[PDB]
């Protein structure tokens, strides 16, 4: 009877996309993965959008979230290249650019991209950076944005507490 | 590199639910499965909602759509019983009652239930049955409703044609 995914729990399927964020230049391409089972997000920054940038991002995401059963992406070439298909086959991860979803596409990662860019803008401005964030402060700020969205430790819709 | 699902195509995941339709009494429980990759629908009628009715329905759906990689259901007991879990393990089909979706729950099968009940009401009324459909005409009418929703062969949003 060995089938997934962790009891009756949700299946381990990720959605990944690249989004451009000039406040993070020169490594302005943010690769973002949302795990649809937990809604956890992993983001990494890249100088150019290539097949290798996608593989480097997923290598980091696997270290953080574990190996997923499948990854959903759009049809960009960094995801459909022979190189990327081989990398995913090496890890045994299924890939779809498909629609076995419940609504139009990969809404989850699109919402994540928006929340992430908003969070980076609010934190950077809080620190006094209204335009590009200085290169030496980018990593900590991106880490801070990722923490804020994942360990949202909140009352976001809760009752009084200390 | 052998991973799913049929190239870059959508993964083979189904959504299944039971819905009550008194026009089909005495076997008024309709079990409905929507394949999220193709949007095909399979419906069967049952006298009572039990674990065995769910297994009988999926046996028919597998003959029509092939064996899926996973099936998503809610937490009703006919789906979480030991009997049903064993049946799914016997076939090697993963089961989730989860949320690895892109919106709230299993909207797909809920929309399917609505379209199906509307279609049965319009066809039955067309035949002169305003209340319960006579037992001997139910199977053909349910088959007609299933055909209408799957081989929707349409211009449903298309240009002039013969």
List, in sequence order, the alpha helices (H) in B17-101: 51-65, 77-80, 82-91
Experimental technique used to determine this entry? X-ray
C-alpha–C-alpha distance, residues A132 and A135, integer Å: 9
B76 CB within 8 Å of a chain A CB: no
Q: How many domains does chain B have?
A: 1
Rounded Cα distance, A34 and A24, in Å: 20
Question: What does the alpha-carbon distance between residue A95 and residue B127 come to, in Å, rounded to a whole number?
Answer: 47
Q: Are A32 and A43 in contact (CB under 8 A)?
A: yes
The first and second tokens of residue A25, run together, are 């230049």
3-class SS string, chain A: CCCCCCCCCCCCEEEEEEEECHHHCCCCEEEEEEECCCCCEEEEEECCCCHHHHHHHHHHHHHHHCCCCEEECCCCHHHHCHHHHHHHHHHCCEEECCCCCCCCCCHHHHHHHHHHHHHHHHHHHHCCCCCCCCHHHHHHHHHHHHHHHHCCCCCCCCCCCC
Contact predicate B51/B78, CB 8 Å = yes
Q: Are B1 and A85 in contact (CB under 8 A)?
A: yes
Q: Do B105 and A102 touch (CB under 8 A)?
A: yes
Do residues A44 and A30 make contact, with C-beta atoms less than 8 angstroms apart? yes
Q: How far is residue B82's CA from residue B77's CA, in Å, rounded to a whole number?
A: 9
Nearest CA-CA partner of B103 in B115, B92, B111: B111
Could you tell me if A28 and A20 are in contact, meaning their C-beta atoms sit under 8 angstroms apart? Answer: yes
User: How far, CA to CA in Å, does B67 sit from each of B26, B63, B64, B122?
Assistant: 30, 8, 9, 32
Closest Cα of chain B to A127: distance in Å? 34
DSSP letter (8 states) at residue A22:
G
Provide the resolution (angstroms).
1.7
Q: How far is A56 from chain B (nearest CA, A)?
A: 19
Give the CATH number of the domain where residue B111 resides: 3.30.420.10
Place of tokens 């052998």: B2
And the tokens for B30? 């309709």
Grouping H, G, I as helix, E, B as strand and the rest as coil, residue B138 is helix
Nearest CA among A27, A55, A15 for reference residue A132: A27
- Which helix or strand (DSSP H or E) is residue B95 part of? strand B94-96
- Residue A54 sits in which domain range? 1-162
Q: Under a CB-based contact definition with an 8 Å cutoff, are residues B7 and A88 in contact?
A: no
Which of A2, A8, A89 to probe the B interface (max B CBs under 10 A)?
A: A8
* Alpha carbon distance A15, A35 (integer Å): 7
- Cα separation of A50 and A31, whole Å? 11
Answer for the pair A113, A34: CB distance below 8 angstroms, yes or no: no
Burial track B9-22 (b if 16+ CB lie within 10 A, e otherwise): ebbbbbbbbbbebe
- Where do we find the tokens 């769910």? B54
- Scored b (16 or more CB within 10 A) or e, B124-154 reads beeeebeeebeeeebeebbebbbebbeeeee
Distance CA A49, CA A31 (A): 9
| Number of C-beta neighbours around residue A92 at 10 A | 11
Set of chain A residues whose Cβ sits within 8 Å of the Cβ of B12: 100
Q: What is the DSSP letter of A102?
A: S
Quote the tokens at residue A98: 């498909």
Q: How far is CA B112 from the centre of its chain?
A: 7
Element (H, E) at A65: helix A51-65
List Cβ neighbours of B91 (8 Å cut-off, separation of 6 or more). B62, B67
Q: What is the CA radius of gyration of chain A?
A: 17
Minimum-distance CB partner of A102 among B3, B9, B103: B103
Q: Give yes or no for a contact between B11 and A70, defined as CB atoms under 8 angstroms apart.
A: yes
| Sign, Cα dihedral of A92, A96, A100, A106 | positive
- What is the rounded distance in angstroms from the CA atom of residue A154 to the CA atom of residue A64? 22
- Is B74 annotated in a binding site? The answer is yes
How many Cβ atoms are within 10 Å of A13's Cβ, its own excluded?
26
* A94–B102 C-beta distance less than 8 A: no
Contacts of B74 (CB under 8 A, 6+ apart): B17, B97, B105, B106
Q: Are B53 and B46 a contacting pair, CB within 8 Å?
A: yes
**Chain B environment of A14 (Cβ under 8 Å):** none
Q: Would you call A95 and B12 a contact, using CB atoms and an 8 Å cutoff?
A: no
B4 known ligand binder: no
Contact call for residues A34 and A14 (beta carbons, < 8 A): yes
Between CA A57 and CA A45 the distance in angstroms is: 8
Q: Which residue has the tokens 């064993």?
A: B86
Q: How far is CA A107 from the centre of its chain?
A: 13
Rounded to a whole number of angstroms, the distance from the CA of A71 to the nearest CA of chain B is 10
Q: How many CB atoms lie within 10 A of CB A67?
A: 12
Beta bridge partners of B45: B30
Interchain CB distance below 8 Å, B96 and A70: no
| B75 alpha carbon, distance to own chain's centre | 17
Please name the residues in contact with A14: beta carbons below 8 A apart, sequence gap of 6 or more: A33, A34, A35, A36, A61, A65, A68, A70, A71, A72
């Amino acid at each position: 009877p060995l089938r997934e995914p962790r009891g009756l729990g949700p299946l381990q399927i990720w959605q990944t996309d690249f989004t451009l964020e000039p406040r993070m230049a020169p490594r302005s391409w943010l690769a973002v993965t949302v795990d649809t089972a937990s809604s956890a997000i992993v983001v990494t920054q890249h100088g150019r959008v290539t097949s290798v940038a996608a593989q480097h991002h997923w290598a980091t995401a696997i270290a953080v979230l574990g190996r997923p059963k499948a990854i959903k992406t759009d049809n960009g070439s960094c995801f459909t290249s022979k190189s990327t298909r081989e990398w995913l086959a090496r890890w045994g991860i299924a890939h779809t650019t498909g629609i076995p979803g419940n609504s139009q596409g990969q809404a989850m990662v699109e919402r994540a991209n928006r929340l992430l860019k908003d969070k980076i803008r609010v934190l950077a401005e809080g620190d006094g950076f209204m335009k590009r964030i200085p290169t030496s402060k980018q990593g900590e700020l991106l880490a801070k944005a990722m923490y804020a969205l994942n360990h949202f430790e909140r009352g976001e819709n809760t009752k009084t507490n200390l």
